[PDB]
Design a protein around this nucleic acid. Structure first.
Ligand SMILES: Nc1ncnc2c1ncn2[C@@H]1O[C@H](COP(=O)(O)OP(=O)(O)OC[C@H]2O[C@H](O)[C@H](O)[C@@H]2O)[C@@H](O)[C@H]1O
Ligand SMILES: NC(=O)c1cccnc1
Length: 209
DNA sequence: ATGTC
């Protein structure tokens, strides 16, 4: 019998540790089109250019770059490309944070969101607004440790949770890290912003390659 | 195993 979604339903945003000061200084993740003060890009430029022009067909509309992106799993295919040094970024996985929240927290906060059933740049991706439609996602695919094939599993592992324009730091519940050295550095950065929520910092080597 | 398509 096919797996269901946990409730609350965790959502994950990966970013380089060099960006955490900018996230705390703004008090939020900003969408790409909101010009976040990022220090370190870990993206593929050629797929960023697709996101730059990919329409979001549910309200509040706009394009994929108008939304702060999350996945429904850690240990993403994106993180594999970073781990293997396939990106322009050559620093590897160790300085990449997993920022964790939930779908339900976003809804309760009244923030506009959409989600997809597969990688959002695919022309056949379905888009949803109602958390009951989390039943449309493939939770086997989302949880799969081996995702390279078959193709439908590879697409559906990359179902995305999309928050319009900005995501408030106070909705982050956990920062997951690869190593003790990165966890310590995360805590030093948080202590420079004493008015900000300090989520638990957890070493989760099984969220990495 | 997996170099986001
Ligand atoms: N306030 C902030 N201060 C500093 N950095 C920030 C802030 N807010 C966000 N960032 C970072 O600013 C950046 C916003 O970029 P985006 O497009 O949304 O996410 P991606 O680049 O991770 O993944 C997209 C790629 O995945 C696949 C395709 O190749 C896509 O291009 C992120 O690093 C944020 O953490
Ligand atoms: N940076 C990310 O975690 C992310 C999540 C979903 C899609 N693209 C990027």
């Amino acid at each position: 019998m096919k797996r269901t979604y946990p409730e609350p339903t965790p959502i994950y945003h990966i970013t380089h540790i060099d960006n955490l000061k900018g996230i705390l200084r703004m008090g939020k993740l900003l969408a790409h089109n909101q010009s976040p003060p990022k220090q370190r890009s870990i993206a593929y430029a050629h797929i960023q250019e697709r996101r730059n022009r990919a329409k979001v067909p549910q309200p509040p509309g706009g394009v994929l770059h108008d939304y702060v992106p999350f996945y429904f799993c850690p240990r993403s295919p994106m993180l594999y490309a970073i781990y293997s040094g396939a990106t322009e970024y050559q620093g590897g996985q160790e300085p990449i944070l997993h920022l964790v929240s939930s779908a339900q927290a976003v809804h309760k906060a009244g923030l506009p969101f959409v989600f997809t059933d597969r990688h959002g740049v695919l022309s056949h991706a379905r888009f949803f607004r109602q958390l009951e439609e989390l039943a449309q996602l493939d939770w086997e695919a989302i949880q799969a440790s081996y995702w390279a094939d078959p193709p439908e599993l590879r697409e559906k592992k990359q179902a995305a949770f999309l928050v319009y324009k900005a995501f408030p730091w106070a909705l982050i519940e956990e920062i997951a890290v690869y190593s003790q050295r990165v966890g310590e550095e995360v805590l030093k950065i948080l202590k420079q912003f004493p008015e900000a929520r300090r989520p638990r910092v957890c070493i989760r080597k099984d969220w990495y390659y």
